[PDB]
């Protein structure tokens, strides 16, 4: 492709933070505070400063990182993965069928 | 082979003679849109290259012997005086830079090799009388008579990457003084060797290098250019052009018809080019005198062309599928190359563009301007009234420093390209020779003394 | 500057070919294919076109009587020559040739006669090749008992430089009857040589290999280059302004 | 319009109202302009803007320079085979008889003689095609005749 | 000035033709004339030059077996195409075509 | 991914327009003027200023927006979609086959 | 010039016609308003040209003018200088003079 | 998408070179010097200045260009291609099976 | 002008006898002028220079 990352003069950084996306990141005790961006972050909310568990669409503190959310290349990456899985499933079915047929014939 | 830069590959790929048969655009002086972005110099009809080739022979192996001249301006026409000097210089060996091929295949992979056995330096001295020669020296050794030269091009070379399919391309930079003018074109990354380094590992090309020989051919791929100082004051402003907010090189939709020369080039751009090249425009447009029309001139390479094509939204004419295209059957061939195949039958491809059987069509204009550079002199009237333009001597610039910002809009291409800009400046240098075997030179390129920061 | 140059194998300073350029880009040489396999060994396809020829015995094609009574026979190594042949258009064909002679290749990899080349092996030019074997195959018409056409089969160092296969019918099993259908086409012309004004042969605008030119006593280099400047292009434009950039001058290439 | 009192162009100051353009059908502006260009510039180059492309003719058409035709060499066209196929041979051994069959496969193809070819004076044709298309079709109508069975 | 122009039907910006320019200026297309009248309706003069062709049934010219067991048939609307044909010069003729189209 | 759009200092905008790609966009009455970029745009052309319908490779004014053209992530997005469709088709076939077999056996 | 318009029978042209009348070709008008009018033919047989010279008027040759504008380029000369130049050019002793070539 | 490449102010270029990636590029005689980036490039190495062939993970001078390496959109592009191939393979199998069955029945 | 030629003291390339020079046979002729004579065969004259 001959595409030279990265041309764009760089930012110099955010300082105040939360720059990255779907880092996910965790709180205190807490755990699971959602990747900057997403609806949960937009809404001013209360009760998350000092308590664990999930009070958002995504949660439990058990599963992370960097949640694959919305649609990026990753969604295509996630979508691509899904497609691959579907293809694999289809292949299995076919195989099974064939086998059965053979058996029958033999009998 | 995998390498698409190999001779075998370019010699194996089979093109379809259908795409360019004796009936293509019958009746026009139009060039295939698929070739407008293809280096026309990398052709086996390049008299220039073909000459140098035979100048060495027809054999693969050949013991050459040539004379290389000095091109560095600072010392080209210099007149050294008595004394001894150390004159050293390096020479590349990369076949892909010293050699050139019509196809531009990677010579480095096609077993291309060169070998230098010996190198000598010749110098001719005028048999001038010692008496006179002595007097001449005495004078040339006075600071009041120091020799001075200046690169002919005189301009800082800049290169900005243009991502594939990209259309807009902004470029921030700032000059503390006043230069002469702008000059620019467009080059293909693959055909541009990364200079500065004693070797380019990613340079798999051997065709003509527009960046050096000056074989440009992508100036017809620009739409508009916008210049602004201090990110606010547009230049030239003052409502000079029909479109005071920018320089429209070409328009797609006529609308008013700011196009001239029966092409797609605006009237504003045409005028500018004429003034910056022949100072012609304020008193009628006429073919300038021959001595001013060199291979690197504008008009000399300007070639407008038009053609009509069967309008797609006229009637049920359907789409002439290239896989169904049949013309001169039994004498033609689908993979067009092999012998004759088929059966005599009334062809169908290529719809009529005349005669009572003519179907509704549609006009299409464009143009080409190769081996040339777009110019935008930094003058109040765009005319050349001296090397040191008037604006380049205006207090507004010499007094305070400003910031520059240009935005180039060009046609999308399916490959990495570059925006070759040329900030015309004054690259001058004085040579002072006080004593025997002593050379003191003083360079000075303004603006852009030593880069920008 | 003096030295050796190797344009490589990709150097083809011309279009078309320099080997049987008038030969149809489909017509094959003397190939002895095989009849779709089975139990049909060999199979010749050629033409015996040699100047008359008195007769033809076990020895071979008689070219005369080697001055006097003793009948002379064609020298296998180069006779008959694929150049010779009858002189008459109708007089030659209408007269009919009882004893004809030709030269044919046996079991080689078929290749369109277009651009076919081989290396010589004798003062006779003939391309007999390393294999010393040569077979004088006698043919009839089917009911007559006489060598109407004598063929001197041989193997050649057949190859193709300025030509490639434009149409390859079968991949493998090529040397069969269906293979001779292959066609040839000349390789694209590719000229190679030193650029204009030898641009690039010398370093310019490169701090890595900046040229030096100072007095031994001064030691201070008078050549200050910047990778920002462009000498190469500068020189080009300069010439197009002082002279007619249409003429040629070998010295500076 | 030029040199036509019927459609004479106007160019006067609104305050003056007195037309400054006085033309006479005796003068010839058109031609005058032509000659003018051929004296100040090279009337051989082209310039789209003014559609300036002086008319001219091919020197070889105006004055025929029949220098003949270089056809010392005969040109031939050979079959796509390189030899017409129509008969089959049969490699047979002598002695013991009149000549015994080979048995090793049969039905070959050998042409006794040269390759059947057709001749054509290439260079000649081109010369003739040139003439007829550049001077024959342009001859005065008096030297022509209406084709056969054709409504005109 | 801007406007529309109509060069008329007498406008032919070129010599020769742009339709079968290699076709003999005497060779006709696939015409189905009549035999000097009498009681001889129709009469075909042409040529069947199509790449091999497995067979030919009531359906038409078989172009293969439409992937698998079912034999595919040429689409009347455009098959066979007057552009297709055998690839071999002698190999094609010497082999003979049993089913031509 | 932790990829912080967008670092590159921003453009400040085109002003003169047509910046976006495959917007498609429509004309007057017109309709269908092709996304900036593509061959149609490069060629200086006439007859499109004051008339509808398509006089380009893409048209009719019925179908838009932002035509999925050439190859981007979308082509992969389009390509991915195509692949998925193919997989689905394959799966259907298999199923059918199986069913048939079963039936046979029963009979 | 032919190909300069295209190869199609129908074609939407767009050209620039210069002034040829000597009396005003190289004239140098001064500040003020003037009425500049002029007529244009439409006879195909005079505006157009053919290689055979056939009567275009009978061969369905037609032209149509949609719009016509007048362009004029002025030198961005300083008002101070421009003013002086005018003062001089307005004296009978400095009247401009031309003559048909 | 209406995504206007390219907003980011451009670089002005590397000058010193090797900017592009997986260009691949070749050496001298050499051939095959690996696309800038990749492990081979990082390690200071000797013996490559004046000799052909591959002394790296990737080589031979026969195959290039711009090697599809690691994971980009191309990997998705490569991954997508792989998925498509798999789907095609699955489809073939199915077909075969069906045919066989049919035959059997007929018999 | 320059040109390369098969060096005579290189390898066993022998001397291309003008009487044995065969190129475009059956379409060529020994006394080159008359019609076509011979039989299509891989020529030999003029050694490759690339």
Contact by Cβ (8 Å): C117, I42:
yes
Is residue B158 a contact partner of residue H12, using CB atoms and an 8 Å limit?
Answer: yes
| Inter-chain CB proximity G37 and D9 less than 8 Å | yes
CA dist C154 and I44 (Å) reads: 15
CA A79 – CA F77 distance, rounded (Å) = 9
Look at residues H52, C55, H5 and name the one whose alpha carbon lies nearest to residue B416: H5
What is d(CA B89, CA B107) in angstroms, rounded to the nearest whole number? 25
Contacts of B261 in chain F (CB under 8 A): none
Q: Which helix (H) or strand (E) holds B9?
A: helix B7-12
* Dist CA B428 CA B148 (whole Å): 7
B360 touching G, CB under 8 A?
yes
Q: How many residues does chain F have?
A: 107
- Chain E partners within 8 Å of D111 (Cβ): none
Main-chain dihedrals φ then ψ at residue D41, nearest 5 degrees: -140, 175
* Residue whose entry in the numeric block shows the structure tokens 């302004």: C241
H/E segment holding residue C193: strand C192-194
Instruction: For B48, name the nearest residue in chain C, comparing CA atoms only.
Output: C196
Mutation pick from G6, G9, G63 vs chain E, by most beta carbons of E within 10 Å, is G9
DSSP A25: -
Structure tokens at B196: 């500065």
B163/A2 CB distance under 8 A: no
Of D107, F49, E43, the closest CA to residue G66 belongs to F49
3-state secondary structure of A39: helix
Residues on chain H touching F74 (C-beta within 8 angstroms): 1
CB within 8 A of C246, min separation 6: which ones?
Answer: B295
B15: CB partners within 8 A, 6+ apart: none
Which residues of chain B have a CB within 8 Å of the CB of D47? Answer: 286-287, 299
The dihedral of CA B134, B135, B140, B142: what is its sign? positive
What length does chain G have?
A: 101
Buried b (16+ CB within 10 A) or exposed e, A6-42: ebbeeeeeeeeeeebbbbbbeeeebbbbbbbebebee
Strand-pair partners of B116:
C3
| Closest by CA position to B380, among listed B396, B400, B357 | B396
Angle at B140 between CA B134 and CA B141, to 5 degrees: 90
Please say whether the beta carbons of C190 and B105 come within 8 A. Answer: yes
**Per-residue DSSP letters for D96-131?**
SSS-B---S----EE-SSS---EE--HHHHHHHHHH
Which residue is listed with tokens 């394959």? Answer: F90
What would you report as the CA-atom Rg of chain I, rounded to the nearest whole angstrom?
A: 13
The closest of C5, C130, B48 to I50, measured between CA atoms, is C5
CB pairs under 8 A between C and D: 106
Beta strand D109-110 pairing with C45-46: parallel
Q: How far apart are alpha carbons G42 and F64 in whole angstroms?
A: 43
* B225 vs D6: CA distance, rounded Å: 48
Do the Cβ atoms of B425 and B183 come closer than 8 Å? no
Q: Do A9 and H14 touch (CB under 8 A)?
A: no
Q: Environment class of residue G45 by beta-carbon count within 10 Å: exposed (0-12), middle (13-18) or buried (19+)?
A: middle
- DSSP string across A8-24: S------SSS--SSS--
The b-or-e profile of G46-84 (16+ CB within 10 A means b, else e) is eebebeeeeebeeeebebeeeeeeeeeeeeeeeeeeeee
C21: contact with D, CB 8 A cutoff: no
Any CB–CB contact under 8 A between B31 and chain F? no
**Nearest-angstrom CA–CA distance, A94 and H100:** 13
**F15–B226 C-beta distance less than 8 A:** yes
Instruction: Tell me the torsion sign for CA atoms B252, B257, B258, B259.
Output: positive
Contact B152, B73 (CB under 8 A): yes
Instruction: Tell me: cis bond preceding G24? Omega within 30 of 0 counts.
Output: no
User: CB of C108 within 8 A of CB of C53?
Assistant: no
Residue B428: C-alpha distances to residues B153, B421, F53, G39 (Å): 11, 20, 59, 57
Contact C34, C41 (CB under 8 A): yes
Cis peptide bond N-terminal to H6, omega within 30: yes
Distance CA B218, CA B208 (A): 14
Q: Could you tell me which residues of chain F have a Cβ less than 8 Å from any Cβ in chain H?
A: 6-11, 14, 19-23, 66, 72-74, 76, 79-80, 83, 86-87, 89-90, 93-94, 96-97, 100-101, 104
Resolution in A: 4.5
Angle CA H52–H54–H59, to nearest 5: 125
The alpha carbon of residue D94 is apart from the nearest alpha carbon of chain C, in Å, by 8
Beta carbons within 8 Å of C236's beta carbon, 6+ residues apart: B212, B213, B214, C196, C197, C199
**Which structural technique was applied?**
cryo-EM
Query: Which DSSP string do the residues of B65-119 spell out, in sequence order?
Result: E--PPP--HHHHS----SS-EEEE------HHHHEEESS---TTTTT-EEEEEE-
Residue whose structure tokens are 């010699």: B11
At G13, is the secondary structure helix, strand, or coil? Answer: strand
3-state helix, strand, coil in chain G (%, to 5): 20, 15, 65
Measured between CB atoms, does C46 come within 8 Å of chain I?
Answer: yes
Cα angle C39, C40, C45 (rounded to 5 degrees) comes to 170
């Amino acid at each position: 492709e001959g595409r030279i990352y990265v041309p764009y003069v760089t930012a110099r950084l955010p300082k105040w933070s939360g720059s990255v996306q779907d880092k996910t990141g965790s709180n205190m005790l807490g755990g699971v505070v959602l990747p900057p961006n997403s609806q949960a972050h937009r809404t001013e909310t209360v009760g998350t400063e000092a308590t664990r568990d999930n009070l958002h669409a995504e949660g439990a503190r058990r599963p992370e990182d960097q949640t694959p959310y919305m649609i990026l290349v990753e969604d295509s990456l996630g979508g691509l993965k899904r497609r691959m899985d579907l293809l694999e499933e289809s292949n299995q079915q076919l195989l099974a069928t064939l086998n059965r047929l053979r058996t029958g014939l033999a009998a | 082979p995998p390498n698409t830069n190999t001779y075998e590959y370019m010699n194996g790929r089979i093109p379809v003679s259908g795409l360019i048969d004796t009936y293509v655009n019958i009746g026009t002086r139009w060039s295939p849109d698929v070739m407008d972005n293809v280096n026309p110099f990398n052709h086996h009809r390049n008299s220039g290259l073909r000459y140098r080739s035979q100048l060495l022979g027809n054999g693969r192996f050949c013991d050459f012997h040539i004379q290389v001249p000095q091109k560095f301006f600072a010392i080209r026409n210099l007149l050294l005086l008595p004394g001894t000097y150390t004159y050293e210089w390096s020479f590349r060996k990369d076949v892909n830079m010293i050699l050139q091929s019509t196809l531009g295949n990677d010579l480095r992979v096609d077993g291309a090799t060169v070998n230098i056995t010996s190198v000598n330096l010749y110098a001719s001295f005028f048999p001038m009388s010692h008496n006179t020669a002595s007097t001449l020296e005495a004078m040339l050794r006075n600071d009041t008579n120091d020799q001075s030269f200046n690169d002919y091009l005189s301009a800082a070379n800049m290169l900005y990457p243009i991502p594939p399919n990209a259309t807009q391309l902004p470029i921030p930079s700032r000059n503390w003084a006043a230069f002469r003018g702008w000059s620019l074109t467009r080059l293909k990354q693959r055909e541009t060797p990364a200079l500065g380094s004693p070797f380019d590992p990613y340079f798999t090309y051997s065709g003509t290098i527009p960046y050096l020989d000056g074989t440009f051919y992508l100036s017809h791929t620009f739409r508009k250019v916008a210049i602004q100082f201090d990110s606010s004051v547009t230049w030239p402003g003052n409502d000079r052009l029909l479109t005071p907010n920018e320089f429209e090189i070409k328009i797609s939709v006529d609308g008013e018809g700011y196009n001239v020369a029966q092409s797609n080039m605006t009237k504003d751009w045409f005028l500018v080019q004429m003034l910056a090249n022949y100072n012609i425009g304020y008193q009628g447009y006429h073919l300038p005198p021959d001595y001013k029309d060199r291979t690197f001139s504008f008009l000399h390479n300007f070639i407008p062309m038009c053609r009509q094509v069967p309008n797609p939204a006229t009637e049920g004419y359907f789409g002439l599928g290239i896989v169904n295209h049949r013309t001169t059957p039994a004498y033609w061939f689908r993979f067009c190359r092999a012998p004759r195949e088929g059966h005599p039958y009334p062809q169908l491809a290529l719809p009529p563009h005349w005669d009572p059987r003519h179907a509704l069509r549609d006009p299409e204009r464009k143009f080409l301007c190769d081996r040339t550079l777009w110019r935008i002199p930094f003058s109040s009237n765009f005319m050349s009234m001296g090397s040191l333009t008037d604006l380049g001597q205006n207090l507004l610039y010499a007094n305070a420093a400003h910031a520059l910002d240009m935005t180039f809009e060009m046609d999308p291409i399916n490959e990495p390209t570059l925006l070759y800009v040329l900030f015309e400046v004054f690259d001058v240098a004085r040579v002072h020779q006080p004593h025997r075997g002593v050379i003191e030179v003083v360079y000075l390129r303004t603006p852009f003394s030593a880069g920008n920061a | 500057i003096r030295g050796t140059l190797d344009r490589g194998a990709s150097f083809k300073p011309y279009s078309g070919t320099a080997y049987n350029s008038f030969a149809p880009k489909s017509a094959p040489n003397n190939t002895q294919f095989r009849q779709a396999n089975n139990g049909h060994p060999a199979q010749t396809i050629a033409q015996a076109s040699y100047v008359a020829t008195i007769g033809g015995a076990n020895n071979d094609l008689q070219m005369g009587v080697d001055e006097r009574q003793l009948p002379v026979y064609a020298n296998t190594t180069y006779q008959p020559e694929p150049q010779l042949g009858i002189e008459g258009w109708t007089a030659g064909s209408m007269a009919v040739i009882d004893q004809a002679g030709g030269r044919v290749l046996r079991n080689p990899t078929q290749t369109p006669c277009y651009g076919s080349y081989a290396k010589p092996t004798n003062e006779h030019g003939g391309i007999t090749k390393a294999n010393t074997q040569v077979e004088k195959k006698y043919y009839r018409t089917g009911d007559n008992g006489n060598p109407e056409t004598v063929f001197y089969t041989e193997e050649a160092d057949v190859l193709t430089p300025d030509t490639h296969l434009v149409h390859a019918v079968p991949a493998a099993d090529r040397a069969k009857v269906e293979g001779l259908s292959q066609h040839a086409a000349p390789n694209r012309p590719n000229f190679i040589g030193f650029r204009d004004c030898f641009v690039g042969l010398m370093y310019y605008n490169s701090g890595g290999n900046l040229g030096v030119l100072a007095g031994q006593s001064s030691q201070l280099n008078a050549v200050v280059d910047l990778q920002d400047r462009n000498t190469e292009l500068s020189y080009q434009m300069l010439l197009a302004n002082t002279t007619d950039r249409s003429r040629y001058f070998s010295m500076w290439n | 319009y030029y040199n036509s009192g019927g459609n004479l162009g106007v160019l006067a100051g609104q305050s003056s109202q007195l037309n400054a353009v006085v033309d006479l059908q005796d003068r010839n502006t058109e031609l005058s302009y032509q000659m003018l260009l051929a004296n100040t510039t090279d009337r051989s180059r082209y310039f789209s803007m003014w559609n300036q492309a002086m008319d001219s003719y091919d020197p070889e058409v105006r004055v025929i320079d029949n220098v003949g035709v270089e056809d010392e060499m005969p040109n031939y066209c050979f079959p796509l085979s390189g030899v017409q196929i129509g008969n089959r041979s049969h490699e047979v051994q002598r002695n013991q008889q009149q000549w015994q069959n080979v048995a090793n496969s049969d039905n070959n193809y050998i042409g006794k003689g040269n390759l059947p070819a057709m001749e054509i004076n290439l260079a000649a044709n081109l010369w003739r095609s040139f003439l007829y298309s550049n001077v024959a079709l342009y001859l005065p109508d008096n030297l022509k005749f209406t084709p056969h069975n054709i409504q005109l």
